[PDB]
Ligand binder design. Structure first.
Ligand SMILES: *[C@@H]1O[C@H](CO)[C@@H](O[C@@H]2O[C@H](CO)[C@@H](O)[C@H](O)[C@H]2NC(C)=O)[C@H](O)[C@H]1NC(C)=O
Ligand SMILES: *[C@@H]1O[C@H](CO)[C@@H](O[C@@H]2O[C@H](CO)[C@@H](O)[C@H](O)[C@H]2NC(C)=O)[C@H](O)[C@H]1NC(C)=O
Ligand SMILES: *[C@@H]1O[C@H](CO)[C@@H](O[C@@H]2O[C@H](CO)[C@@H](O)[C@H](O)[C@H]2NC(C)=O)[C@H](O)[C@H]1NC(C)=O
Ligand SMILES: *[C@@H]1O[C@H](CO)[C@@H](O[C@@H]2O[C@H](CO)[C@@H](O)[C@H](O)[C@H]2NC(C)=O)[C@H](O)[C@H]1NC(C)=O
Ligand SMILES: *[C@@H]1O[C@H](CO)[C@@H](O)[C@H](O)[C@H]1NC(C)=O
Ligand SMILES: *[C@@H]1O[C@H](CO)[C@@H](O)[C@H](O)[C@H]1NC(C)=O
Ligand SMILES: *[C@@H]1O[C@H](CO)[C@@H](O)[C@H](O)[C@H]1NC(C)=O
Ligand SMILES: *[C@@H]1O[C@H](CO)[C@@H](O)[C@H](O)[C@H]1NC(C)=O
Ligand SMILES: *[C@@H]1O[C@H](CO)[C@@H](O)[C@H](O)[C@H]1NC(C)=O
Ligand SMILES: *[C@@H]1O[C@H](CO)[C@@H](O)[C@H](O)[C@H]1NC(C)=O
Ligand SMILES: *[C@@H]1O[C@H](CO)[C@@H](O)[C@H](O)[C@H]1NC(C)=O
Ligand SMILES: *[C@@H]1O[C@H](CO)[C@@H](O)[C@H](O)[C@H]1NC(C)=O
Lengths: 118, 408, 182
């Protein structure tokens, strides 16, 4: 068989007459997150659109955008500083951290049917 | 007019497009060092395209953030819905759903219907759908509870019927009309917002503006991918066959033809994307302005936030766009009367303060312009100026004063 | 981009012109001609798009000057955050700077309110402002600044009876003619 472009999607193996599927191997860009040469010399790298099963080699963290290496996941949310993607942002506490961005402080106004503020 | 009707109309605006990116060297000739060397003789042609694609990809997030990030804090509605008879159940988020999306925007998300190639990738947006829904929920809660106050300073609470009385007064109709027709107005509001769900769910092609961009992007990508099988003059359209069958001293020409053809195709694609991105940016700016001027306040521009006299608006979210729900005021049933520009009493011409003189055939009254409400003519609603020989076409009548019956 | 080769022997035109034979020079110069023409066309198109964007920005700036500096805008968030008062322009390299001056309320309080007041079987509504109570008595104030006033027939109007509106309260109104008649 062949794809919509002039490439083969499958083949028949000689000497056995067997059908073998074909899938292209992984590829993607590389990004470097830096707080600045005026602050530190540490970086974290992200291998876009690939999962941490394959290959600076410190930690592993799987997000919806790729495999992030060199940053530590944390739970408490803060205002976004460096956008990474899909709701994940990323120096604080002598390390590079990755968290989920926060939309703002939660506030509730006291609604009543005979009250007003002037 | 002697009656009125409250109407609700929608409006659809696109905001953003998909963030795609194409790699020049991989697309033009991949996994081959015997073409990259020849390609390296052309300069920054494989850098400018990447720069432009990165620019549009960055611009899309700015579009989304400008449209939707308009609030400071995240407001929340009270647990008890005592809104004086008004019913907002169809636009407020539903707490029993896996995703806290209102029924109308749930139908909107389900109505519109939105693979792998070589060198082509798609990037995810920075803001998820849940965050956009949360932003719209905060906006809607703020406008329900505090009116337009939360757009200028701190939010100050006010009962909803009183806010609606203020908005009625803002178009030229006094508030006692609402205080006397509250139940009727609430029922009309509920029925009008109820019709919207059926109108959206049953009418085809109501969301064509948001499907057009998806179709155009998919078609452009498909054409770019299909262009890889053309010959452009070489003996074969695939690179490996010619590369592995002939000496490079002869294969140079065959490689060069493919190189120039594919470069031209990529340039055409990038230019088209740039023009479309500019168009989408203009639409996003319009949507941001409409949100700012119709949701956070009351607009007096004609036919900007609906057809009629504007009262309020409620936003909803949608894939790659926003949806507005304009609430307006329309007169219903009129009548015929006889008027006059002035009343001549005791040799002096009297003019009305607010309204127009009307007569039902025998007597003379004063009424406001947008609603029939006859009042007797006294000195507290008419101001005197001049004499009766200047103004053309005036009549005679008797103007009373409240002082005389009280002092006798 | 002038230093690129584009597939000829050398990028510099004088070298190829004065080293080979004329029939081959007329073939080697065409590649350079085509490459340089392509570069110029790309530059021109990008300049056209950038100029369009700059024109849109200039139109917006002109509109803002006309509507904020020459008058007092009522559009929300068009000439600053808050209620607009005025504006001042300043120049800059390839641009302009606006200094919007606005009005922001602060230091709010807490009150109780009613839509109408029933006196002698007649419902009264405020001409301008709102009804508020500090806990015992009823006053009339404006909306954007707290300023109490004693309820009087001057700042309220009457329409109808007390059996129609919802949330009416009982109180007393005062007429200017009372001290004079006494
Ligand atoms: C007006 O008074 C009410 C209650 O007397 C205030 O509402 C309370 O506000 C605090 C502060 O956030 C909350 O912790 C309480 O839960 C609220 N109680 C109720 C019953 O709503 C309200 O904040 C006051 N308003 C102003 C402007 O001071
Ligand atoms: C103004 O229009 C409304 C709606 O058309 C009228 O309300 C209707 O009145 C009839 C007769 O009482 C009822 O059968 C309908 O059910 C009412 N409609 C609604 C939605 O409640 C109203 O009567 C009109 N005003 C006047 C003065 O006639
Ligand atoms: C406010 O409006 C909602 C409509 O969304 C009402 O909920 C409906 O109630 C009827 C009768 O119980 C049900 O048949 C519908 O299925 C409900 N709608 C939905 C979407 O579930 C609600 O009852 C109204 N509020 C009040 C107080 O009546
Ligand atoms: C006010 O009076 C005018 C004229 O007296 C009415 O206009 C007439 O309407 C009928 C019904 O369609 C037509 O057949 C006549 O030709 C109209 N007259 C003219 C001169 O065009 C009008 O309908 C009245 N207003 C109301 C609310 O009934
Ligand atoms: C990569 O490995 C993780 C680990 O289980 C898996 O969840 C993910 O689906 C893998 N990536 C792809 C593209 O399947
Ligand atoms: C975050 O909290 C979850 C449970 O709430 C916990 O399992 C997880 O370990 C926490 N994250 C870290 C980095 O400890
Ligand atoms: C006009 O108004 C007067 C005052 O109420 C009334 O007496 C008269 O019957 C009215 N005429 C008509 C035709 O309705
Ligand atoms: C209106 O037109 C009629 C024409 O018959 C005329 O007699 C009358 O004076 C006019 N009224 C005014 C106020 O000009
Ligand atoms: C109004 O009064 C004047 C003088 O009393 C008179 O000349 C005029 O005709 C009167 N108007 C009408 C419509 O009768
Ligand atoms: C409310 O204002 C009046 C002013 O007339 C004052 O006498 C009264 O003490 C005030 N109430 C409270 C609770 O302060
Ligand atoms: C406010 O709501 C309560 C019930 O919670 C009700 O008793 C009261 O009458 C309402 N106030 C007005 C002015 O209707
Ligand atoms: C207001 O006064 C009337 C009599 O003047 C009385 O019938 C009514 O119950 C009073 N309202 C309240 C809320 O007590």
């Amino acid at each position: 068989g062949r794809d919509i472009a002039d490439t083969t999607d499958a083949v028949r193996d000689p000497q056995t007459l067997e059908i073998l599927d074909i899938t292209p191997c992984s590829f993607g860009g590389v990004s470097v997150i830096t707080p600045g040469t005026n602050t530190s010399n540490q970086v974290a790298v992200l291998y876009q659109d690939v999962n941490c099963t394959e290959v600076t080699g410190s930690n592993v963290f799987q997000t919806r955008a790729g495999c992030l290496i060199g940053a530590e996941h944390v739970n408490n949310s803060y205002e976004c500083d460096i956008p990474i993607g899909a709701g994940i942002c990323a120096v604080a506490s002598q390390s590079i951290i990755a968290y989920t961005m926060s939309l703002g402080a939660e506030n509730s106004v006291a609604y009543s049917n005979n009250s007003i503020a002037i | 007019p002697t009656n009125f009707t409250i109407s609700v109309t929608t409006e659809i605006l696109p905001v953003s497009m998909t963030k795609t990116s194409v790699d020049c060297t991989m697309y033009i000739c991949g996994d081959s060092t015997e073409c990259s060397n020849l390609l390296l003789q052309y300069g920054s042609f494989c850098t400018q395209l990447n720069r432009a694609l990165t620019g549009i990809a960055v611009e899309q997030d700015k579009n989304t953030q400008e449209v939707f990030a308009q609030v400071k804090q995240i407001y929340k509605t009270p647990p008890i819905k005592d809104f004086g008879g008004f019913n907002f159940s169809q636009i407020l988020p539903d707490p029993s759903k896996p995703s806290k999306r209102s029924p109308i925007e749930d139908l909107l998300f389900n109505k519109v219907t939105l693979q792998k190639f070589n060198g082509l990738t798609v990037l995810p947006p920075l803001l998820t759908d849940e965050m956009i829904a949360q932003y719209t929920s905060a906006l809607l809660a703020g406008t329900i509870t505090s009116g337009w106050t939360f757009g200028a300073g701190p939010a100050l609470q006010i009962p909803f019927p009183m806010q609606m009385a203020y908005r009625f007064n803002g178009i030229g109709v006094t508030q006692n009309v609402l205080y006397e027709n509250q139940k009727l107005i609430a029922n009309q509001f509920n029925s009008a917002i109820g019709k919207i769900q059926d109108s959206l769910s049953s009418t085809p092609s109501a969301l064509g503006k948001l499907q057009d961009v998806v179709n155009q992007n998919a078609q452009a990508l498909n054409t770019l991918v299909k262009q890889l099988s053309s010959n452009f003059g070489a003996i074969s359209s695939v690179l490996n066959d010619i590369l592995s069958r002939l000496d490079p001293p002869e294969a140079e020409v065959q490689i060069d033809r493919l190189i120039t053809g594919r470069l031209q195709s990529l340039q055409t694609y990038v230019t088209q994307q740039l023009i479309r991105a500019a168009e989408i940016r203009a639409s996003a700016n319009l949507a941001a302005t409409k949100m700012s001027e119709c949701v956070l306040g009351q607009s007096k521009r004609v036919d900007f936030c609906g057809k009629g006299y504007h009262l309020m608006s409620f936003p909803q979210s949608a894939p790659h766009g926003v949806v507005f729900l304009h609430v307006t005021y329309v007169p219903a049933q009129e009548k015929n009367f006889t008027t006059a520009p002035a009343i001549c009493h005791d040799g002096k011409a009297h003019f009305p303060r607010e309204g127009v003189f009307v007569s039902n055939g025998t007597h003379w009254f004063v009424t406001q312009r947008n609603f029939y409400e006859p009042q007797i003519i006294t000195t507290d609603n008419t101001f005197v100026s001049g004499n009766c020989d200047v103004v053309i076409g005036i009549v005679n009548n008797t103007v009373y004063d409240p002082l005389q019956p009280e002092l006798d």
